[PDB]
Amino acid sequence: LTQSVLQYIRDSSVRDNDILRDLREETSKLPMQIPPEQGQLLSLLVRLIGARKTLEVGVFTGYSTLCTALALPADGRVIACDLSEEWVSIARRYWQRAGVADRIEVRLGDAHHSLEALVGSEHRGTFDLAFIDADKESYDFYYEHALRLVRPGGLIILDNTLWSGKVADPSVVGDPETDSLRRINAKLLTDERVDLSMLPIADGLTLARKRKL
Numbered sequence: 001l002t003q004s005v006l007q008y009i010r011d012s013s014v015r016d017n018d019i020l021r022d023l024r025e026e027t028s029k030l031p032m033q034i035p036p037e038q039g040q041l042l043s044l045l046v047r048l049i050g051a052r053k054t055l056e057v058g059v060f061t062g063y064s065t066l067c068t069a070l071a072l073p074a075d076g077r078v079i080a081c082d083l084s085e086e087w088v089s090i091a092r093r094y095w096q097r098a099g100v101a102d103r104i105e106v107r108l109g110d111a112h113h114s115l116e117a118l119v120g121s122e123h124r125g126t127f128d129l130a131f132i133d134a135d136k137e138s139y140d141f142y143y144e145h146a147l148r149l150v151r152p153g154g155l156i157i158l159d160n161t162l163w164s165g166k167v168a169d170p171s172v173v174g175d176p177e178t179d180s181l182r183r184i185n186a187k188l189l190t191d192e193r194v195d196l197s198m199l200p201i202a203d204g205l206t207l208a209r210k211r212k213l
């Protein structure tokens with residue numbers, strides 16, 4: 001049973017707290033259930049690379065942002081390109097509760113517009129890490145912009161790259177989101193600009209380290 005093993009990973013390794021628990025419950029009741037193991041991995045990766053400045057695309061109720069910001073130093077910053085207006089007050093409340101609201105710079109609005117502004121700014125090539133969880137049709141655009149935005153040696157992370165297994169399912173034909181993911185996953189395999197690892201965790205997580213050239 002894969003369900004019993006997934007339950008065991010959560011029971012035996014997730015370091016939860018009432019802030020994270022409440023945010024997952026509140027998000028579940030809105031009109032995907034948050035996988036806590038993924039936020040915890042993101043926090044570990046931030047610490048492992050000694051990240052100080054990170055980029056996020058998606059944000060939603062701010063769970064990944066909260067995990068990321070808690071792993072940063074006090075002077076650390078997250079530029080959070082938020083695609084959900086409806087939920088900013090939720091995200092803000094949990095960031096304030098955790099004492100990290102001052103580390104998070106919210107950029108609400110179209111992701112393409114935000115990333116174009118960032119590439120055309122002093123922020124280009126300064127990010128230690130970028131985390132992308134957004135509309136799958138746009139992943140190639142987000143990846144290409146993250147590659148310009150992160151420093152050499154920086155880490156790009158694309159979430160949900162396994163898309164409920166649809167990428168592997170031969171019966172899924174004519175679906176724009178699945179086709180876009182199949183294209184970007186295939187492109188990353190042979191992209192000499194990065195080191196790659198695709199993880200099965202929480203609906204797939206692709207790690208791409210920008211090579212120094």
Ligand SMILES: [Cl-]
Nearest residue numbers: 210211212213
């Ligand atoms: Cl390298």
Ligand SMILES: [Mg+2]
Nearest residue numbers: 057058059133
């Ligand atoms: Mg996100």
Ligand SMILES: [Mg+2]
Nearest residue numbers: 160202204205
């Ligand atoms: Mg995932």
